[PDB]
Amino acid sequence: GPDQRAQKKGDIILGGLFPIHFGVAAKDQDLKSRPESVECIRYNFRGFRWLQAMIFAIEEINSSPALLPNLTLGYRIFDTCNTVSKALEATLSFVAQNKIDSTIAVVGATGSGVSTAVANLLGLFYIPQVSYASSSRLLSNKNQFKSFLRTIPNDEHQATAMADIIEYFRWNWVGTIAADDDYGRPGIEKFREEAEERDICIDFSELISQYSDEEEIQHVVEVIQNSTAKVIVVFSSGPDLEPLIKEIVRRNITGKIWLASEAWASSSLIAMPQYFHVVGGTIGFALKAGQIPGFREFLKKVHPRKSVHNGFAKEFWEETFNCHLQFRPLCTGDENISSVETPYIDYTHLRISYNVYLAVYSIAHALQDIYTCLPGRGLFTNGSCADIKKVEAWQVLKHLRHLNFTNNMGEQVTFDECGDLVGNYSIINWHLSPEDGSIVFKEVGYYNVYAKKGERLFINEEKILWS
Amino acid sequence: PDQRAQKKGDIILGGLFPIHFGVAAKDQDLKSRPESVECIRYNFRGFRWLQAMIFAIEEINSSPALLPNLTLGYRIFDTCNTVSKALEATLSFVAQNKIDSLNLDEFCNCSEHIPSTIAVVGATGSGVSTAVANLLGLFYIPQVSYASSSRLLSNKNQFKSFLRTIPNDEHQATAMADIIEYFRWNWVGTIAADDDYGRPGIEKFREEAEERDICIDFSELISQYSDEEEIQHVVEVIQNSTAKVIVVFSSGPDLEPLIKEIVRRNITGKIWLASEAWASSSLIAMPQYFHVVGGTIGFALKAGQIPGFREFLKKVHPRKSVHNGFAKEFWEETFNCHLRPLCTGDENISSVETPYIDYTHLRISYNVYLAVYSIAHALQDIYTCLPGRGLFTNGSCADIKKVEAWQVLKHLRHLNFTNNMGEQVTFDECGDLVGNYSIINWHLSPEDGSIVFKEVGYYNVYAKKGERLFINEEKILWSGFSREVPF
Numbered sequence: 001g002p003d004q005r006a007q008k009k010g011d012i013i014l015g016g017l018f019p020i021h022f023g024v025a026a027k028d029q030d031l032k033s034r035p036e037s038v039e040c041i042r043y044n045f046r047g048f049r050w051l052q053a054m055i056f057a058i059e060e061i062n063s064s065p066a067l068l069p070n071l072t073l074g075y076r077i078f079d080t081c082n083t084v085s086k087a088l089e090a091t092l093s094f095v096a097q098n099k100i101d102s103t104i105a106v107v108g109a110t111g112s113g114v115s116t117a118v119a120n121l122l123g124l125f126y127i128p129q130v131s132y133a134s135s136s137r138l139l140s141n142k143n144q145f146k147s148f149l150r151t152i153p154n155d156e157h158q159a160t161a162m163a164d165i166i167e168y169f170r171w172n173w174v175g176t177i178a179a180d181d182d183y184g185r186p187g188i189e190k191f192r193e194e195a196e197e198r199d200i201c202i203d204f205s206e207l208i209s210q211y212s213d214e215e216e217i218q219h220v221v222e223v224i225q226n227s228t229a230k231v232i233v234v235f236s237s238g239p240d241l242e243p244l245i246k247e248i249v250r251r252n253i254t255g256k257i258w259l260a261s262e263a264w265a266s267s268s269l270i271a272m273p274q275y276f277h278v279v280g281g282t283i284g285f286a287l288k289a290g291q292i293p294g295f296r297e298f299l300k301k302v303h304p305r306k307s308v309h310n311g312f313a314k315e316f317w318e319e320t321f322n323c324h325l326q327f328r329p330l331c332t333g334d335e336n337i338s339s340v341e342t343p344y345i346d347y348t349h350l351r352i353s354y355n356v357y358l359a360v361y362s363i364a365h366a367l368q369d370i371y372t373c374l375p376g377r378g379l380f381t382n383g384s385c386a387d388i389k390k391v392e393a394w395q396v397l398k399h400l401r402h403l404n405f406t407n408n409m410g411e412q413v414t415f416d417e418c419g420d421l422v423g424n425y426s427i428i429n430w431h432l433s434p435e436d437g438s439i440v441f442k443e444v445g446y447y448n449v450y451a452k453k454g455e456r457l458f459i460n461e462e463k464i465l466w467s
Numbered sequence: 468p469d470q471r472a473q474k475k476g477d478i479i480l481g482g483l484f485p486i487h488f489g490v491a492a493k494d495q496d497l498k499s500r501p502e503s504v505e506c507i508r509y510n511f512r513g514f515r516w517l518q519a520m521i522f523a524i525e526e527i528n529s530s531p532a533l534l535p536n537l538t539l540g541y542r543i544f545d546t547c548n549t550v551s552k553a554l555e556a557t558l559s560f561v562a563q564n565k566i567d568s569l570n571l572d573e574f575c576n577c578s579e580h581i582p583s584t585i586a587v588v589g590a591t592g593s594g595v596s597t598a599v600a601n602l603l604g605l606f607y608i609p610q611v612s613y614a615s616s617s618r619l620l621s622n623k624n625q626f627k628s629f630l631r632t633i634p635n636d637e638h639q640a641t642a643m644a645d646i647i648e649y650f651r652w653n654w655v656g657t658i659a660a661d662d663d664y665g666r667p668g669i670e671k672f673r674e675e676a677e678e679r680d681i682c683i684d685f686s687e688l689i690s691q692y693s694d695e696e697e698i699q700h701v702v703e704v705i706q707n708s709t710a711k712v713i714v715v716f717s718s719g720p721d722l723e724p725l726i727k728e729i730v731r732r733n734i735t736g737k738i739w740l741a742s743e744a745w746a747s748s749s750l751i752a753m754p755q756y757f758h759v760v761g762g763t764i765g766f767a768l769k770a771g772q773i774p775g776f777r778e779f780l781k782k783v784h785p786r787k788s789v790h791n792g793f794a795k796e797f798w799e800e801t802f803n804c805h806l807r808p809l810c811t812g813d814e815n816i817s818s819v820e821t822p823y824i825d826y827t828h829l830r831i832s833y834n835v836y837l838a839v840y841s842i843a844h845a846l847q848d849i850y851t852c853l854p855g856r857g858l859f860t861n862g863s864c865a866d867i868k869k870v871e872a873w874q875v876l877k878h879l880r881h882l883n884f885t886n887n888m889g890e891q892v893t894f895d896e897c898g899d900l901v902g903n904y905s906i907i908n909w910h911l912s913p914e915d916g917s918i919v920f921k922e923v924g925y926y927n928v929y930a931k932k933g934e935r936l937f938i939n940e941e942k943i944l945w946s947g948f949s950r951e952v953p954f
């Protein structure tokens with residue numbers, strides 16, 4: 001498969017897909033010469049941290065005598081660059097054996113459009129796929145996506161929560177903006193429905209993307225400028241929102257109340273001090289934080305020399321310290337992760353990282369249920385058991401479907417009939433640090449998804465800065 | 468990959484067609500290894516589409532002028548209107564390319580006689596074509612769809628190798644808004660197939676409706692595989708709404724279960740605005756639904772002609788058609804027999820009415836024909852390329868003895884030829900072809916008792932905004948029969 005990867009041999013192999021870069025180099029192909037492989041661009045430190053959470057979980061599991069005693073979990077982890085084409089190249093390598101007719105499960109991907117394309121392929125071979133971040137309602141369809149599960153909740157609930165917040169403040173007038181993809185469009189469509197139900201009037205609705213040109217961006221900015229709406233609901237990833245926000249900042253459009261979907265509510269591409277005059281005071285959703293003891297210390301042990309199995313550690317180092325590995329100064333190999341602020345280690349809560357950790361543990365526990373299976377008490381024909389020495393992916397899928405374990409936070413993890421894992425949301429608000437000058441994500445509330453109308457939303461208004 | 472239509476040649480075109488309407492829905496409990504899904508419900512019109520591709524290729528091969536050195540072969544698979552079947556097929560189309568991408572030729576035992584697919588014709592449903600395009604685009608294999616009209620496929624960043632001989636739905640959705648504004652209708656309902664055809668068609672409709680101050684009372688989603696509760700919910704929304712006009716963006720197969728239940732409950736007096744995929748669908752235009760579905764107003768693509776195609780169609784035979792492995796089941800389904808009594812092998816295609824041969828106009832069939840000819844002409848442009856005047860680096864030319872798919876794509880992107888109807892065929896920068904629409908209205912035949920598609924207007928996409936619609940109000944029969952409005 002692909003050149004740059006994180007790989008380690010084992011008895012049972014987990015595939016991994018993570019956005020180590022935010023995108024791909026805009027060399028629009030006129031096809032005058034044979035297309036070359038496209039270059040990934042813009043290092044995603046947070047994504048590398050996500051990838052680390054998978055490697056951490058696997059090492060921790062292998063270090064546990066109790067969990068899967070006979071066996072070692074290995075891995076094969078690739079960079080998607082947030083792009084369907086790269087994700088799919090990687091995925092063709094995961095199914096290489098099956099297609100000729102060995103990867104037993106896949107953790108990923110991030111964007112719902114990437115996970116969809118991956119799922120169409122993995123589902124052919126009944127290889128289970130557990131996404132840590134793809135939240136589109138479209139992936140809940142088990143007729144189309146037969147092998148897909150996720151440790152993040154479905155956006156039906158988040159979109160409803162957005163309508164509930166607006167109704168809570170007795171607002172009645174908003175604008176909407178959505179990424180033109182399988183995350184933004186179904187999220188905002190559900191929002192529209194719930195908003196109409198609550199007599200919230202929507203003054204405009206625009207689409208954006210990472211690749212919107214100057215005219216498209218200009219048009220959206222003009223719609224925003226010509227509207228009396230103050231509250232703008234935005235369902236988008238950071239990369240898809242960034243070009244719009246840059247232009248809004250350029251024109252100094254001040255005083256908007258931004259309501260942020262979870263994909264950009266914590267995005268370092270948007271939460272930048274020099275945008276704060278436009279973007280300050282945004283209110284957004286975040287998933288519930290989880291804890292992973294020892295993960296931060298593991299993170300600080302990365303090294304381009306010592307990390308033999310993780311071929312992304314090299315570029316990570318070069319990007320962090322702005323150097324080149326043996327004029328771009330050469331890296332010493334002795335520099336200090338703690339001296340440079342990036343999202344790699346500058347975080348307070350683990351959210352998506354926790355979902356990654358749970359995705360791996362879901363797979364591991366499903367395998368453990370195979371290991372401990374007693375004849376007659378199994379899930380397959382005639383109460384038969386699968387053989388863990390010769391496990392097939394479809395058996396792991398079966399076990400993932402019936403999985404029920406208690407996680408380190410004391411919570412039961414099970415997947416519903418659609419492969420979804422239910423969850424609540426935290427509500428955060430963008431403040432400026434008086435110490436730091438940086439944007440701080442203050443928790444101001446939470447949303448309890450499965451409570452009765454009018455008992456779901458808990459907000460501490462006193463904590464909100466409207467700028 | 469078992470049943471297929473296949474024939475060797477120097478240059479191979481892939482094909483994808485919905486020979487069945489769907490698959491046997493059977494939730495797998497995964498107590499034993501999953502088996503492949505069963506395709507169900509023979510699609511005679513789709514088999515005709517597949518025939519138009521084979522016909523075009525035989526015609527081209529019979530032409531001394533067009534591609535003289537070379538023969539075009541083909542490898543054509545049934546999608547059953549499903550992503551998974553389409554993708555199994557597509558993995559065969561890219562088998563060679565894929566081995567190269569992963570260096571798999573060295574690390575496992577791999578053949579040296581895997582024939583290369585140079586272009587693919589298909590698929591039908593936009594949801595299927597999108598998934599196929601993600602894969603074909605990886606290898607820059609050109610894909611020319613004859614029916615996938617979603618605006619999403621116009622995105623060349625995502626779908627690098629996709630083109631089509633059908634217009635995208637942006638104008639069609641606009642036309643629906645124009646018609647409503649024309650009749651001063653308001654508080655309309657919308658229904659869309661929950662896929663990449665229905666959702667973006669209705670989204671564009673919503674935008675245009677808003678621009679014209681048309682209010683929408685409900686918006687529901689449906690599919691072929693909706694369960695009883697889902698269908699019941701949508702029928703209840705329709706029952707509880709004051710809306711008389713309902714805009715429906717869906718294929719026939721995705722609409723059929725909803726319509727059956729609407730008929731079951733005798734919901735009458737609705738004005739249905741039909742997207743092009745179901746405005747002529749034999750699954751919906753059935754006499755016994757006419758009390759619900761009569762008077763539907765919908766869109767139809769421009770017809771084209773293919774001399775000799777009808778006669779080619781009548782030549783099909785389970786014995787003689789060695790290359791077309793769908794001919795067997797076609798025969799059995801047409802004559803209700805087995806190779807249910809045994810088939811003689813001598814029965815007559817003209818004795819049984821199915822969509823195979825019971826048609827007036829070739830529309831999607833013509834798109835299929837043009838898709839194949841688009842590929843052939845792009846190849847011809849390679850054949851006739853003169854050094855310095857070529858499309859590649861330094862005005863260089865491709866070698867037609869060693870053509871690569873990406874070069875065909877390049878040529879398709881700049882293709883400009885004149886078709887048998889005297890029209891220029893070119894694709895815009897998004898891989899799209901422009902087309903007008905006829906507006907049709909569902910009448911009942913006084914002779915036949917069957918549903919007839921009366922032209923009552925047209926939509927000219929070349930005219931200025933607000934001057935594209937023409938309707939002849941006098942020709943509309945409301946609820947299918949009434950010249951008096953309202954009644």
Ligand SMILES: O=C(O)[C@@H]1Cc2c([nH]c3ccccc23)CN1
Nearest residue numbers: 110111112133134135136183263
């Ligand atoms: O499904 C999707 O496309 C989004 C992608 C996404 C989510 N959360 C994120 C955090 C960082 C980067 C990307 C994301 C939630 N679902």
Ligand SMILES: O=C(O)[C@@H]1Cc2c([nH]c3ccccc23)CN1
Nearest residue numbers: 591592593614615616617664744
């Ligand atoms: O893009 C899609 O999914 C639809 C599929 C489709 C169209 N027209 C048709 C006629 C007959 C059967 C199917 C179709 C237009 N685009």
Ligand SMILES: *[C@@H]1O[C@H](CO)[C@@H](O)[C@H](O)[C@H]1NC(C)=O
Nearest residue numbers: 218219220221222223225226
């Ligand atoms: C917004 O206002 C500008 C300046 O008055 C006007 O000319 C333009 O047509 C408007 N643009 C949009 C997209 O509404």
Ligand SMILES: *[C@@H]1O[C@H](CO)[C@@H](O)[C@H](O)[C@H]1NC(C)=O
Nearest residue numbers: 251252253254255276277278
């Ligand atoms: C935007 O407008 C403010 C006043 O609201 C003005 O000071 C300046 O032009 C802009 N703000 C900044 C931080 O540049």
Ligand SMILES: *[C@@H]1O[C@H](CO)[C@@H](O)[C@H](O)[C@H]1NC(C)=O
Nearest residue numbers: 403404405406412413414415
């Ligand atoms: C999961 O297991 C716990 C502990 O036995 C049990 O209480 C809970 O009811 C189970 N949940 C499901 C959904 O099976």
Ligand SMILES: *[C@@H]1O[C@H](CO)[C@@H](O)[C@H](O)[C@H]1NC(C)=O
Nearest residue numbers: 421422423424447448449450
């Ligand atoms: C959300 O939190 C509430 C309050 O702690 C709890 O009762 C509920 O079960 C949680 N829901 C989910 C889906 O985790």
Ligand SMILES: *[C@@H]1O[C@H](CO)[C@@H](O)[C@H](O)[C@H]1NC(C)=O
Nearest residue numbers: 699700701702703704706707
């Ligand atoms: C429609 O009919 C009545 C409205 O009062 C009610 O019993 C039923 O639940 C309604 N259904 C829907 C989908 O609105």
Ligand SMILES: *[C@@H]1O[C@H](CO)[C@@H](O)[C@H](O)[C@H]1NC(C)=O
Nearest residue numbers: 732733734735736757758759
């Ligand atoms: C259904 O209702 C209409 C009258 O509005 C008509 O088509 C038909 O006579 C009715 N049939 C039944 C069984 O109710």
Ligand SMILES: *[C@@H]1O[C@H](CO)[C@@H](O)[C@H](O)[C@H]1NC(C)=O
Nearest residue numbers: 882883884891892893894895
């Ligand atoms: C195609 O060819 C004709 C003349 O043969 C030319 O005039 C026309 O502009 C061409 N079409 C396009 C879209 O370039």
Ligand SMILES: *[C@@H]1O[C@H](CO)[C@@H](O)[C@H](O)[C@H]1NC(C)=O
Nearest residue numbers: 769890901902903927928929
């Ligand atoms: C569309 O309609 C008008 C004639 O009504 C004409 O200008 C144009 O040629 C038509 N285009 C096509 C592709 O038929």
Ligand SMILES: [Cl-]
Nearest residue numbers: 019080109110
């Ligand atoms: Cl990803």
Ligand SMILES: [Cl-]
Nearest residue numbers: 123145146147
């Ligand atoms: Cl799947």
Ligand SMILES: [Cl-]
Nearest residue numbers: 238239267268
């Ligand atoms: Cl981000």
Ligand SMILES: [Cl-]
Nearest residue numbers: 484485590591
């Ligand atoms: Cl098809």
Ligand SMILES: [Cl-]
Nearest residue numbers: 604626627628
């Ligand atoms: Cl493509």
Ligand SMILES: [Cl-]
Nearest residue numbers: 719720748749
């Ligand atoms: Cl149909």
